[PDB]
Amino acid sequence: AYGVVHISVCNMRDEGKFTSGMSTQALLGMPVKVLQYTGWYEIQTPDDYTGWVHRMVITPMSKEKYDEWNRAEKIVVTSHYGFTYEKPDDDSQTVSDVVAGNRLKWEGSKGHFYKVSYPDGRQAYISRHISQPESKWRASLKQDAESIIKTAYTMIGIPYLWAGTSSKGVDCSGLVRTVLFMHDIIIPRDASQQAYVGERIEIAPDFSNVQRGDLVFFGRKATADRKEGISHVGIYLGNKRFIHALGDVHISSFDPEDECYDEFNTGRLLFATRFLPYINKEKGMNTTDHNLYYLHH
Amino acid sequence: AYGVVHISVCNMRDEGKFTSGMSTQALLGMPVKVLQYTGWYEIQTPDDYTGWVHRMVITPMSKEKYDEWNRAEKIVVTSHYGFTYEKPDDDSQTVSDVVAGNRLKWEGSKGHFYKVSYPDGRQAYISRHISQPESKWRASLKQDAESIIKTAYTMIGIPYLWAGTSSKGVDCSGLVRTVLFMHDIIIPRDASQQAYVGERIEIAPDFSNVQRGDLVFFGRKATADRKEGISHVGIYLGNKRFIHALGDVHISSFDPEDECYDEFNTGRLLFATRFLPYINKEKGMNTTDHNLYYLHH
Ligand SMILES: [Cl-]
Ligand SMILES: [Cl-]
The missing domain is CATH 2.30.30.40 (SH3 Domains)
Structure with a gap:
């Protein structure tokens, strides 16, 4: 019923076979719940995400x-x-x-x-x-926007990888999760779920109400007949710029004066979210020493 | 018609979409043939393997x-x-x-x-x-069994990753390819194609005719009604031991006296191949300075 990941990065898949698509990734030493065994383990990571891994990448354990x-x-x-x-x-x-x-x-x-x-x-x-x-690491930790952006900048050029959730390679929501995990924070895995945690910010035309460290969400705008669709996510850097994973981790802009202007995503920008003030104050957003997968309960 | 990979590791897929399975990986600076463009590029690596990548990971170029x-x-x-x-x-x-x-x-x-x-x-x-x-790197290079095994040992514990073809994570044939590319060698991508290059060795019961650096192949033994199936590959280390990727990169044995004995693969062992003496002497096995993707023609 319980397991611990014992390889640097394990690859969780939609089904219990390599020929199924990767859905997310877990890290060495990360506690997981084991939901079933078919030759492959169906596991659940501390973000409540479920996926399948080969038998040899986790160490099953008693609750004790x-x-x-x-x-x-x-x-x-x-x-x-x-x-x-x-x-x-x-x-x-x-x-x-x-x-x-x-x-x-x-x-x-x-x-x-x-x-x-x-x-x-x-x-x-x-x-x-x-x-x-x-203990030394937790005591010196910073969880403010500047600290998270500083980490995001150390990831520039790293490849995009579908369901990538580690320094090896990341997808758009995977980048947000990797950077945050380096600051002990867990938020939902999917960009669709990240969009509805924290405070939703309706972006002003000049971006004056969007702050460094806010997330920016892209997709299909809500119509009267159809709800909004979330297809992408980035971290706001201020001055109409954002860092995101698309091809690789890079900086893009909403300003056509900038060489890194991203036309396709500028035209699909939906809203921003302020999530950093709400860690351990809202469901789905926590630190590992406040996360029930890491604690006896 | 031509391109060059411009990210550390790019992820080639069976179809031009992220929701299709990864088939192989190419590396930064690697020349590729571009077969088509649909929004995604269908590319061909110097091992003749074909796969699909997102538009932003390769630099298309003129032949010049x-x-x-x-x-x-x-x-x-x-x-x-x-x-x-x-x-x-x-x-x-x-x-x-x-x-x-x-x-x-x-x-x-x-x-x-x-x-x-x-x-x-x-x-x-x-x-x-x-x-x-x-130039310095090529002149200093060794391509003997001892040199290839020494590289393989620096990869112990690295995760298994379906279609993994880099130091980041490898599959079984991917391990061989990554180890060999570090010695400037290219052989076929699939374990099924690796099995039919070099000299096939019919393994003696005591393994006395199997040498360090030979490849060992596993799968379904040939029947009168059905040809042999290749499902796995490892590198022979001598003394009935082999290195391979399965869960992670690790050493296994064909001897039940050893703690690292692999019962499932020992029972599926089909044959070995001696390929290192035949680089640039047989089709499908070459060095990058003898590979036509790297040279004007
Ligand atoms: Cl990808
Ligand atoms: Cl995998």
Whole structure:
């Protein structure tokens, strides 16, 4: 009934087969609920999203051991990319790759390394240059618009990947989720669900009422006969510019004077949302230390 | 009719839509043939594999411009992961991520960095610690079994990813292709096509006629009414062990005395192939400086 992801990034699919489309991705050390087993596991991530994974990428656990995994202080991976090693030496045999958001059980310290262990039982060493203890990490965390935009800028040029939810590759809602997870925040996975959390902002023609860190939503405008359709999402940067994933992670503008002007999305702009003031104050938006998948209940 | 990939890893799909399954991946700086345009490009990689990509991930070019891209000396990315920067400073704004096998146009040198340019026109700086000039790289290259196994071991723990063809995540045939591309070698994309290049080895019960660096193939054994089916592939390491992608990149054994014994694949082992002595000596197996997609013709 419970499991923990034990690979850097696992690929959740619409059905329990590789020949089905990827729907989302979960990260190393992330607790999940297990809904069924058919040879493949149907799992549920802390954002309530459900998808299918191969049997070998998660560690099934009793409620007791799942609660013990969640209780243990973690080493949090803060760099986009890296590796873990068999020895506290970056020239020794690797154990796996890691991505930002990966969390491993803290087992000690040696040199400039943290001793860590995987949910499956593997032991490794990880550099203090790409990671830090969870307690130290939480205490220095910032969750304001400037901090989230600063993270979003470190992701420029990263490829677009349909259902991509990690530093390896992201889709439009996946970019928002990856950046936010680096600041301990979870919001819904789909762009359609992200559009209806936080405060809806009806954009002024000059964009004067849209702030840095707001999300911008694109799609089919509501008609009298048909409700609005959400097809895309970006993060507002101020000055009529936004960062988003389309082809790759890049900056675009609503101003035709800018070389990065995005004509197709400017014409489909529907509204903005202010969500950062409402984390842990509204359903669907929380931090991992307030999320019930991470806590005994 | 010609294009060049301009993102670290692009995702080629069975149809021109994200809701179709991924079939393979191409890398930054890789020349491709453009077969059609529908809003999405149908492209063909240097392994003759065809797939669909979004319009914004490739730079279409005239035959002239494509030939000029292929002639220019490249900076080759040799590390699994990294970034390019706007300035010769690793604290400056990034341009994109890079993976091993990525190739950029060499534009100069500054400090411990190479000045590079992307097929789309972006300019960046890339560290000398994760990359090297193509000419120096080719002259230093080893293409023997020991060298290919050494690369395969640097990929342990990396996730399995259906149609994965890069350091980010690999499938079984994808592992082979990624390891080989890091040694300038191209062989067919599908495990079904890899099985019929090189010399077929009928495995002796004690494995005494199987050598390090041989490929091992799994599937359905040939019956009188039905030909053999190829479902999986691994690289032989000697001592009845092999490295492969299944859940993640890991080592498995054909010996039940070993803890890493793989019962399901041991029972489906069909044959081995010796391919490394036949690069540039048989159709479908070549080096990039012998591959017609990389050369004027
Ligand atoms: Cl994609
Ligand atoms: Cl997968």
